[PDB]
UniProtKB/Swiss-Prot annotation, chain A:
Organism whose genome encodes this protein: Severe acute respiratory syndrome coronavirus 2 (2019-nCoV)
Function in brief: Precursor of the fusion protein processed in the biosynthesis of the S protein and the formation of virus particle. Mediates fusion of the virion and cellular membranes by functioning as a class I viral fusion protein. Contains two viral fusion peptides that are unmasked after cleavage. The S2/S2' cleavage occurs during virus entry at the cell membrane by host TMPRSS2 or during endocytosis by host CSTL.
Residue span relative to the full protein: 746 to 795 of 1273
Name the record gives this protein: Spike protein S2
Gene behind the chain: S
Length: 50, 50
């Protein structure tokens, strides 16, 4: 809708702030996954004899 | 003036809420730094990768 978009432009930078917060949330989850599992330098392999 | 007052109050409350969340994160990091100073500078640590 063009009229609603032009009326939404009269408000501040709210939707820049809500877009910036969710991107910071979404980038943070990859850091959470990286901090727990990627603690080992080399991908080790087990011997065939078990 | 009522419309402008409502908009500025909403913006300032958004700023205060974001500051509270950032302050909680900073306090958690400060507690971690205090624990690291107490356990690693003032003594020898047996915890792995601490």
């Amino acid at each position: 809708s063009t009229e609603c978009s032009n009326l939404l432009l009269q408000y501040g930078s709210f939707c820049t702030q809500l877009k910036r917060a969710l991107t910071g949330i979404a980038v943070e989850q990859d850091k959470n996954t990286q901090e727990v599992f990627a603690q080992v330098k080399q991908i080790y392999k087990t011997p065939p004899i078990k | 003036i009522d419309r402008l007052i409502t908009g500025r109050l909403q913006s300032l409350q958004t700023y205060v809420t974001q500051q509270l969340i950032r302050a909680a994160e900073i306090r958690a990091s400060a507690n971690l730094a205090a624990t690291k100073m107490s356990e690693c500078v003032l003594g020898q640590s047996k915890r792995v990768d601490f």
